Design a binder for this molecule. Sequence first.
Ligand code: FES
Ligand code: FES
Lengths: 65, 65
Amino acid sequence: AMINLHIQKDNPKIVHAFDMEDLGGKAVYCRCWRSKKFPFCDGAHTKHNEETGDNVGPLIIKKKE
Amino acid sequence: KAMINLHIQKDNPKIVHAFDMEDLGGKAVYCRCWRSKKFPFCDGAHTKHNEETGDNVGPLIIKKK
Ligand code: FES
Ligand code: FES
């Protein structure tokens, strides 16, 4: 069973590379591949966890202050 | 129907990782397939997942400019 079901299925390996300056003060990244704002988290993991019984959540990268 | 995460910290109801940009050093490669033995970091387990399921998931790279 696949993890990603709809994102850029013409791409054989979806990879996102960012410079830390592109994150600003905080970036919240999607790790469930259900977000409408992918690679960013939009809270779609909540609906996925409720329907499948999963426990996935996002990745948060922020500035120290 | 089926879950994304199968074995990582199943006692945790929502797996979230939060880092300061200083904790990344020069480059961090984050897992988005939940198959890595070094989770939240990518160990290349996505290649085996993509080969077996026909998926196209890949990691998230955050680096210094
Ligand atoms: S929407 Fe995918 S982890 Fe939040
Ligand atoms: S091991 Fe999960 S994306 Fe590389």
